Design a protein around this nucleic acid. Structure first.
Ligand SMILES: [Zn+2]
Ligand SMILES: [Zn+2]
Ligand SMILES: [Zn+2]
Ligand SMILES: [Zn+2]
Lengths: 67, 68
DNA sequence: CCCGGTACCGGG
DNA sequence: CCCGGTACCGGG
């Protein structure tokens, strides 16, 4: 059907791009950011990803310091 | 604070207007001539699975008795 | 901004 | 009727 754009999918917000024609969806406009489409796109769980990077980062640093 | 859908509409993943329909059963439930019940804790039920499963446990029993 | 958690579309 | 699968609300 009428899928939601990348940003709106990431922010789990109501997207009206499919109605906004070539003009960026309201949301992406209210943020002055390219309203991109990609039926393939999947949301990124930020919070998690960060906790991971911090952990994987410390773990790395720590391991290196072991010399 | 969101408006939950009635049992039947949840079971059928159909648009439910139970709320904006006051005491009168949700549109969908009325047309099906069935009770429009509301239960927050209600979870749908996968029919096709249940059936396929029920047929196996039965057919397994059929082969055992037949294989004798 | 982010997301847990639903409502519901579209199609078989 | 049934559902796979995705849009979006409601809130911190
Ligand atoms: Zn959008
Ligand atoms: Zn957009
Ligand atoms: Zn209903
Ligand atoms: Zn109903």
């Amino acid at each position: 059907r009428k899928f939601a754009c990348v940003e709106c999918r990431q922010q789990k917000s109501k997207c009206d791009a499919h109605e906004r024609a070539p003009e960026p969806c309201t949301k992406c406009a209210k943020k002055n950011v390219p309203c991109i489409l990609k039926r393939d796109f999947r949301r990124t769980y930020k919070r998690a990803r960060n906790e991971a990077i911090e952990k994987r980062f410390k773990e790395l640093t720590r391991t290196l310091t072991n010399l």
